């Protein structure tokens, strides 16, 4: 049901009004909504149909409060004409110019009495006059004189008068309520309107049950005490002395108040009042400059202290907080109250009892709180059942807010409240309402008796014996008044069709039609604030006549206006019927019928769930899911691997041509002592070559690394063409291949055998010598590297003397105490000899006691050797010795060094050839396969390394708040009294400017290149080979690049394209249905299935390069017999494992000439496989170890989706958006309509002047702040319309445009960040992107650019939650501080950040694009809006809250697997974390904890 | 030695006793709440942080011994934490006992003098009362309507007692205040 506020606003729109709202302070929201319902002409000039509004108030201070309120809550220009501004003596000229600038003229009744009385501003010019505190306007009053102005002016052109009042009749005038109320109605030309007494609003005047009532008596003091007179005389002496002065009045008032407190509330209570006066006088003495003024405040204090000394001394006759000291020294009034409190509150249930005591003044409250606390504490009967508090300078307000809440929460049982002259006490229904000081006003009587709300509750009133009769009389007069106001206000309060059966045969009934409409309204996407419901409206005679003939002349018709979130937008007019009921029932039936026809209700007449809507489009868009066996309507995978096409069937034959692409390794370092062995050798012209039957494309230039330095590898583009003329030359090539991987770099496992069948990876590696040719002698001699046999001393004698040339560059190993460590003879040290001492014959002999014999040669050269690295992986960034002992393989040094780098060039090339294949395919599809930079003339660029990758509200906090001196008077240490002064002065911690003004200061365009490549085909650049290799390289591979950076642009673009496609294809849907289908069209599963169908997952670089344990070398495979068995039997394949494979131990013929394994070995193998299962380590997944053997990989379901996104990214970056769109139909993500091409998605239709302009009142300022001027302002209107807006039937909500907007923003921001933040890692880029498109970063900008003044809504909650946020941010500096990020949002289920503020910014971005239809102009707005936050966030990226919690130095996150435990000042505190999804839930829990940690 | 200095300004200025407590493990935050005013100083060591916080508490409490010598003569104030060790400060309510909280001996002379009526009791009765209580009067004129010129007498005490009255009766009000307070 609609809240009282909205119903009041409807009634006021229909007719004149006097809104009597006793409680709830909702007058302001109603004033603001009425002002907005009559603001369709606040833009036109008065010369031709312009109209302006007035907000007349009784007092200038009240007028300031109402002008500030209007500016904060509205987009209307507000003038503040108050008499003190010399607003008098204004010529018609001036009152003409000021009605031209301002629209809602807020002022005092005198200023406007003169304005309207003189012919300055006619009543015709006004659309709405709002009169605040309308009770005051009786008899002779500016309000009443204004309404007589109305009774003389031309009729049919008079404003809508809306008076507002909280007190219906002025105080003590209670004689003839009925006549006064009738007169007030006649004055404001319209009936009073008030709400009933229900749960939502407690009406004081219309409550029925009356509490039990008591009147208590107390006699006059028998003797006035002496200290009362003496203290009184001393204050008289002071008054005479200070009269002779030079402020003075205030010092006097405080002393006169003290006197009142002393006489009426007693000697004891004075002892608590004098402490109060001392505090006040000291604070003030400090707050001075003139010495003489300070002198007055010092002499007063000296008197106050004499008083405390005196008043206390009297009590001392009997700490003096004892019961028997408060009892004996107290005016009989307080003695009665203290006893009455004690005897009544003897139920002793602290939670049960609740007592309100009302007192006359503010200082009284202070003193009586004190007396009550010290009596209760000292009284055994009341202590522990009664806890007191007092309700009556910025800091002062906060303390009272805590006190009011304490009573409402139930910590405090008693509340001492001062007089409520024109306001309602805002506390819950009490139980025993006591009134210590006599009632002086009707408003006091009604507001007080109001708090006692049950019959069980009591209303007790203390009066003296003498005044008893007169009070008994006034209470009867105040009871008769209540019963009269009540009846008058009782009158003025805010209070068969045949069925239809569908084809199925289900029956819709006209009774349920409203229930079904309400369920449909609960389905459409709504904010946390609440659901929206249809708006009914009975038609007046003129409308009924215009819409229908004599048919509805005597009959009633009601229209139903569905919410804009609902598909139905046209008003449905009901059947012309006899009753108001058959109007509403018929309207509902007609609406349900139209909704059913529009397919928004099931055949069973119940609104369609998200699941049912998804099921209809599941076959249309998600068909591929079926083959893989998982359907959309409710880990990792093992893929095969394929060598590139050039490496398949590449084994060179013996009658055909053979292409040898020589590999040229070029060091890119500086020669030193360290690297001289590296430079010269790598650049030697003895390079190896890849020999294969198939030709190779132009391959890029890869960066390899080494201990010494980086070096660049360049496979030569031209192939030397050679024909093998023999079958034994082929065997020479094959044996040399085998011996490199078997010996030079050990990559041999027992199972490995030479693969003489072409199959896969069948290319060879061949030595090349100076044109160039295959080295056939190196091949013969080194079929197998010889063993380091070593020798004996006698045997060493016959060896020929070593020759210098023999060991110039060759490779040697030391025979003494070592096994197969090869080392390079950098230079022969011919000059020095073995006999020479090292900087030596002995040195070696001693080092190897028996291992070395006496050297045969006393004089010979000594060889210098630098050992060779043992690592075969290269992607991530002077041992002179005796010659006789070392073993000399005759192998060239030139090749041995280069061949160590071979396994990592060969792997990189496999993946680079896969990359060129993808390049060619995509280019061919996008039909860019002929551009001269993409044709046969394509010359690729070197792989570049990504260096970024790691591999390479108040200011004071809680503890600084001063103690309330008022609530703790008798135990405040003098030190605090000083702290309070400085803290309050801050030493320790407008009408010429429009509300929509953007402050000119620093808080805290260059065109996107992708949007230039999109418009102009000249800017298009070649999709490179290194880019596709990065786009298939997973991060786990530990290479120099990855798919992570391209994946950010690819994900952003895939989300934009899916949004634009779904918004254009299905433009009758809600954000709810469109956002679910999108979040499921870009989901990992859909993308995984798409990539699997495109065959891309087999060609992926995802597994690390451990060249020895996880790599089968080219032309070397498992025994063919075993490989056939692995594939033939799925059952044995499972048991075939590492241990079994290593035991095979093939040798000689088995591992060389003959491929197939011997039958005996096969038997040994199979028995082994059975044994594991039948014995131990059975049912173990050895799949990781033995997968590398059969050519299978396990890739997660994440890497596949990331690869799809990265390929999309490559295409976007190099070719712009139109060529990229084509790619989405290649992967079959977006099915393409024949009528609408996919490429033209940008220009596809994603989708009276005077009426539209009415809603947009100051749109010039919106456009000036946004930076974009709207041509078609229907887009502006839809961007601003919240779903809770009943007057905008031209367009829809902001919810349709936000969908399109969050994609346009995400894509543009991501393109910008990619292009400009290339020194930031992909993780930091994901964090910066997620922190720039947040819903709290958008809400800050919306408030900063003052665009929230134009949001069209009428929700109470939203408007309060928006105002609390805007007032938070206005102090924060309009910057995205940490605090704003920690604030709860709508998603994290109490909301501090309203979601509407952010959706409206996204919608304005969407609207900018639809009007301009140019993503370049949409960027100039987005950049100017986000320029401050892009600069700051790039300087310091906002971390995930998880990171802030985990990285909290003092706190220790303890998430539950989501309750989080933390340490604040080392106190054990756990706050439960809630969230539908664990990943989102983790963040949400962090945020809650982070606020809690700040809470401390 | 900031802890000692803070403990001292607290005991000397008649402020309450400071209570320092470090609670966070990790590297130590000291919460000291001399008189419901709590300031936090955090540093690497348990003992080291305390020192920093004590400066912070001291700075705020100090911001708000020539004179003290005299007051020490008229009262039993300890004057050092250690002196307090030698063997719950004044609240705003109990400052009214300044002159009254004084050494039995000086007052007993003043009580006798104010009660005794044996001399030229003009300003010789008032001077006697104050002179026994080691009091110096800073007499000064009023600043307007000086008929029988008023005198503003200020006494040299923490209480900041200033008395104003007519020229003839300034001398009687001094006598009266003193009588009531003692």
Author numbering:
A (entry chain A): 8 to 24, 25A, 26 to 253, 273 to 344, 352 to 425, 436 to 538, 554 to 581, 582A, ...
B (entry chain B): 95 to 120, 127 to 164, 188 to 210, 216 to 310
Give passages from the manuscript:
The RNase III enzyme Dicer-2 associates with its partner protein R2D2 and cleaves long double-stranded RNAs to produce 21-nucleotide siRNA duplexes, which are then loaded into Ago2 in a defined orientation. The Dicer-2–R2D2 heterodimer has critical roles in both siRNA production and siRNA loading onto Ago2. The present structures illuminated the detailed architectures of the individual domains and interdomain linkers of Dicer-2, which were not visible in the previous cryo-EM reconstructions at approximately 7 Å resolution, and revealed that Dicer-2 comprises an amino-terminal helicase domain, a DUF283 domain, a platform–PAZ domain, two RNase III domains (RIIIa and RIIIb) and a carboxy-terminal dsRNA-binding domain (CRBD). R2D2 comprises two dsRNA-binding domains (RBD1 and RBD2) and a carboxy-terminal domain (CTD).
We determined the cryo-EM structures of the Dicer-2–R2D2 heterodimer and the Dicer-2–R2D2–siRNA complex at 3.3 Å resolution. A structural comparison of Dicer-2–R2D2 and Dicer-2–R2D2–siRNA revealed that, although their overall structures are similar, the central linker becomes ordered and interacts with Dicer-2 CRBD and R2D2 RBD2 upon siRNA binding. R2D2 RBD1 in the Dicer-2–R2D2 structure was not resolved in the density map, suggesting that RBD1 is highly mobile in the siRNA-unbound state. R2D2 interacts with the helicase domain and the central linker of Dicer-2 to inhibit the promiscuous processing of microRNA precursors by Dicer-2. In particular, R324 and E331 of Dicer-2 form salt bridges with D288 and R223 of R2D2, respectively. A structural comparison of Dicer-2–R2D2 with DCL3–dsRNA suggested that Dicer-2 recognizes the 5′-monophosphate of dsRNA substrates in the 5′-pocket and cleaves the dsRNAs 21 nt away from the 5′ end in the RIIIb active site, consistent with a previous proposal. The modelled dsRNA sterically clashes with the helicase and CRBD domains of Dicer-2, suggesting that these domains undergo structural rearrangements upon the binding of dsRNA substrates.
